[PDB]
Ligand binder design. Structure first.
Ligand code: AR6
Length: 168
């Protein structure tokens, strides 16, 4: 597939990065897969999840509530594929570890492995926000784990500028 992703810096053969709001990227590109940085309950309160959900006029949350009622919570490091609504064909909800609540940072690798089930993804840095993982570590795990084509949208300008001048 050829998508309209534009303005990305190349990190590796398969990883690209941009200082952009993932919601705006998704609206513009309408990718096959947008990744959400979820919790196990799919309660999309803030950060990427809250912003994606608001942009769907709460349809993502309503769908997620049905998913949980049927299937129960995700695993830490796990994922599910749901609709992307008005933003993308699909949303891959992926749960990084909540390091701030004692969950094992090693599960971040398991979380990123879910990306390998999709040829192309628009994604955030899992666990790097409210979940408290070091952002550069999340980027390095992404680079070292994901083999499919991943376009990373980093909202925060100061963070982006630091990440792109760090070794991988
Ligand atoms: N609109 C955005 N576009 C791109 N990146 C963003 C955006 N908003 C935040 N980031 C960055 O995206 C990165 C991830 O920040 P987070 O979204 O907190 O995800 P987590 O995995 O740490 O925490 C999961 C919880 O977050 C939610 O509350 C969920 O419901 C979960 O409970 C950071 O670098 C952010 O600067």
């Amino acid at each position: 597939m050829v998508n309209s992703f534009s303005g990305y810096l190349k990190l590796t053969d398969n990883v690209y990065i941009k200082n952009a709001d993932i919601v705006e990227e998704a609206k513009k590109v309408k990718p096959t897969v947008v990744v959400n940085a979820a919790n196990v309950y799919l309660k999309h309160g803030g950060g990427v999840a809250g912003a994606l959900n608001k942009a769907t006029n709460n349809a993502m949350q309503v769908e997620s509530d049905d998913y949980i009622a049927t299937n129960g919570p995700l695993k830490v490091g796990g994922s599910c594929v749901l609709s992307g609504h008005n933003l993308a064909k699909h949303c891959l909800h992926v749960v990084g570890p909540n390091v701030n609540k004692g969950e094992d940072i090693q599960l971040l690798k398991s979380a990123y492995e879910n990306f390998n089930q999709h040829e192309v993804l628009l994604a955030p840095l899992l666990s790097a926000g409210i979940f408290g993982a070091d952002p550069i570590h999340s980027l390095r795990v992404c680079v070292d784990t994901v083999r499919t084509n991943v376009y990373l949208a980093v909202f925060d300008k100061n963070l982006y500028d630091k990440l792109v001048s760090s070794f991988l």
